[PDB]
Amino acid sequence: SGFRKMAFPSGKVEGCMVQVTCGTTTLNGLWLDDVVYCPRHVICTSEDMLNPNYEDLLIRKSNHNFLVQAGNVQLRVIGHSMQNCVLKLKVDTANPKTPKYKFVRIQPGQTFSVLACYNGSPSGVYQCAMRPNFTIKGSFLNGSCGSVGFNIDYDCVSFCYMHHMELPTGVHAGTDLEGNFYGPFVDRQTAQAAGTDTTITVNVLAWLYAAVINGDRWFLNRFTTTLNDFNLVAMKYNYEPLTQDHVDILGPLSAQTGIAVLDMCASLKELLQNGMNGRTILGSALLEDEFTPFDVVRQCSGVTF
Amino acid sequence: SGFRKMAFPSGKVEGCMVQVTCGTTTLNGLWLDDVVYCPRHVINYEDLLIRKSNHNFLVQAGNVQLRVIGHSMQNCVLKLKVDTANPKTPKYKFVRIQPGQTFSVLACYNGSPSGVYQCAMRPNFTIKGSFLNGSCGSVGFNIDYDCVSFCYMHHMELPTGVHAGTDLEGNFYGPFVDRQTAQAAGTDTTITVNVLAWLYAAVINGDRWFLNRFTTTLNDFNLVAMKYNYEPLTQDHVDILGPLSAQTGIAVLDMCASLKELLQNGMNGRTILGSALLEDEFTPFDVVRQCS
Ligand SMILES: O=C(Cc1cccc(Cl)c1)Nn1nnc2ccccc21
Ligand SMILES: [Cl-]
């Protein structure tokens, strides 16, 4: 019993964190096999950030300009290449702690663990979700660039995010491990703002199924809804549209608890209309949207209370 | 910017998790040097233990079987002497924590870590964790510098879904016993010094709608706080909040007057750090560490 925001054990990622220094800038890098991955803005000054020409800044650099530190050992850089907004530093030593891994690009609504680092040293781990506006509500300070997001389903680490910047609202933007940004963001200091954010509907529904699994049914009602009528109501509360794919994905939780997806949708419509009336759901007074249908199945029991 | 419930990196603890099997029971053990620590309920405990031999205990570290060469009991923890020292043993200490203190939990099943979360020792000595059958033996810890301080070992779940366990020396937190009997969590209270620390964190992150021009005495605040099932705030708590008070410019009793108004009037449709409830699972030190 219980339902916590749970992160994956970070050990497999801790053994990959390194410190990358270029001139006066110091940030984090991910050391996998003989390559160190880090944000390409490590080669920039604060002035350069307005309109940086990365190809022009990189051509002026040599291997020995990049200092890479793994614990108390200095790694030797033997090559460098750029792939989109990521810099790949070829090093002379393969990381003996390299876990089994894959680079995966995620979609909005997906969750992942973040290992926040400073100076190549891990300081904390937390769970978060890729928002519909492609930002993440993380907890990062100056020096955290290069920190990574990941999932560890089974024994394989799937790297899905690398931290690049903080937007003016305090939210964070970054790339996949191939250097492609999530969202319409660029690694440039220019007027950039996160689009209006929305609630991840399929995740709120999954969390309502988790509450039913843990023994709570106070929010259920005798009504059902059509998918279209649900979406017309949901869009008035800034909720993401619920698609047929989302309904299909909620199938297993619907079969486990005995509550059809559109009946759970009707309970959601009512909660949006009435609020909680002094009650909580899984210790929360707000509707939680940072647990996916897959997270609920992984964390909750297979036997409904 | 941002404020998340953050756990310590779990790697130093992952390298200590093992699977312990005795008969039909399978739970988790903590392998430090040549000793495996696990709940004694894996087996009148002296009478049950005397009937066991070393080979009855099966210990598995990854895909390798460890050889048990000795066994002893310390309070509600069983210590299994093994033939191999854990080469991954970190620098460590066994520490007993107080209610209100927070720690990270590495939840495990079959000696395999599955998740890490942050939680607090409630004033009623229970923890609001997330555990399933097979999680027994999972541990709670903090990291201070490069040293792991082990503070909790999971033993059981109470009928309300909350959890109970011991320190690493086998002494229970709370008036609980390790057996199937009628046990219940006492009435819980809110950790006041932690709510205040979380209000300072909100001010640091630019959330100031709850600030007011008022102050209060420590006694008047405590008369108010006890009415809402909040733990009493002591002069030690006020002293501990000193650095956050100097950083934000809001005196502790000034922040108490904000807390008094939040308890009597509610939040009025507003949130604080994305929460509609007053959060009490961040200590003053957690706030300073996450905001530095
Ligand atoms: O934002 C930057 C530098 C930067 C500026 C402009 C563009 C780019 Cl790609 C990078 N660093 N970061 N990242 N997270 C932070 C949290 C707080 C303070 C600074 C932080
Ligand atoms: Cl995805």
Swiss-Prot record, chain A:
Residues 1-305 are cytoplasmic. Changing residue 142 to A: Does not affect ability to cleave and inactivate human TRMT1. Changing residue 90 to R: In strain: Beta/B.1.351. Inhibited by pyridone-containing alpha-ketoamides compounds 13a and 13b. In turn, alpha-ketoamide 13b (tert-butyl (1-((S)-1-(((S)-4-(benzylamino)-3,4-dioxo-1-((S)-2-oxopyrrolidin-3-yl)butan-2-yl)amino)-3-cyclopropyl-1-oxopropan-2-yl)-2-oxo-1,2-dihydropyridin-3-yl)carbamate) inhibits SARS-CoV-2 replication in human lung cells. Inhibited ex vivo by michael acceptor inhibitor N3. Inhibited ex vivo by compound 11a and 11b. There is a cross-link at residues 5, 90 (Glycyl lysine isopeptide (Lys-Gly) (interchain with G-Cter in ubiquitin)). It is found in: Host cytoplasm; Host Golgi apparatus; Host nucleus. It comes from the Viruses. Changing residue 145 to A: Complete loss of 3C-like proteinase nsp5 cleavage. It catalyses: TSAVLQ-|-SGFRK-NH2 and SGVTFQ-|-GKFKK the two peptides corresponding to the two self-cleavage sites of the SARS 3C-like proteinase are the two most reactive peptide substrates. The enzyme exhibits a strong preference for substrates containing Gln at P1 position and Leu at P2 position. The active site is at residues 41, 145. Residues 1-305 form the Peptidase C30 domain. Cleaves the C-terminus of replicase polyprotein at 11 sites. Recognizes substrates containing the core sequence [ILMVF]-Q-|-[SGACN]. Cleaves and inactivates human TRMT1, preventing tRNA guanine(26)-dimethylation of tRNAs. May cleave human NLRP1 in lung epithelial cells, thereby activating the NLRP1 inflammasome pathway. May cleave human GSDMD, triggering alternative GSDME-mediated epithelial cell death upon activation of the NLRP1 inflammasome, which may enhance the release interleukins 1B, 6, 16 and 18. Also able to bind an ADP-ribose-1''-phosphate (ADRP). 3CL-PRO exists as monomer and homodimer. Only the homodimer shows catalytic activity. Interacts with host FBXO22; this interaction promotes the proteasomal degradation of nsp5. This is 3C-like proteinase nsp5. It comes from Severe acute respiratory syndrome coronavirus 2 (2019-nCoV). The chain holds residues 3264 to 3568 of 7096 of the full protein.
Swiss-Prot record, chain B:
The active site is at residues 41, 136. Changing residue 133 to A: Does not affect ability to cleave and inactivate human TRMT1. Inhibited by pyridone-containing alpha-ketoamides compounds 13a and 13b. In turn, alpha-ketoamide 13b (tert-butyl (1-((S)-1-(((S)-4-(benzylamino)-3,4-dioxo-1-((S)-2-oxopyrrolidin-3-yl)butan-2-yl)amino)-3-cyclopropyl-1-oxopropan-2-yl)-2-oxo-1,2-dihydropyridin-3-yl)carbamate) inhibits SARS-CoV-2 replication in human lung cells. Inhibited ex vivo by michael acceptor inhibitor N3. Inhibited ex vivo by compound 11a and 11b. Residues 1-292 are cytoplasmic. It is found in: Host cytoplasm; Host Golgi apparatus; Host nucleus. Changing residue 81 to R: In strain: Beta/B.1.351. It catalyses: TSAVLQ-|-SGFRK-NH2 and SGVTFQ-|-GKFKK the two peptides corresponding to the two self-cleavage sites of the SARS 3C-like proteinase are the two most reactive peptide substrates. The enzyme exhibits a strong preference for substrates containing Gln at P1 position and Leu at P2 position. Cleaves the C-terminus of replicase polyprotein at 11 sites. Recognizes substrates containing the core sequence [ILMVF]-Q-|-[SGACN]. Cleaves and inactivates human TRMT1, preventing tRNA guanine(26)-dimethylation of tRNAs. May cleave human NLRP1 in lung epithelial cells, thereby activating the NLRP1 inflammasome pathway. May cleave human GSDMD, triggering alternative GSDME-mediated epithelial cell death upon activation of the NLRP1 inflammasome, which may enhance the release interleukins 1B, 6, 16 and 18. Also able to bind an ADP-ribose-1''-phosphate (ADRP). 3CL-PRO exists as monomer and homodimer. Only the homodimer shows catalytic activity. Interacts with host FBXO22; this interaction promotes the proteasomal degradation of nsp5. This is 3C-like proteinase nsp5.
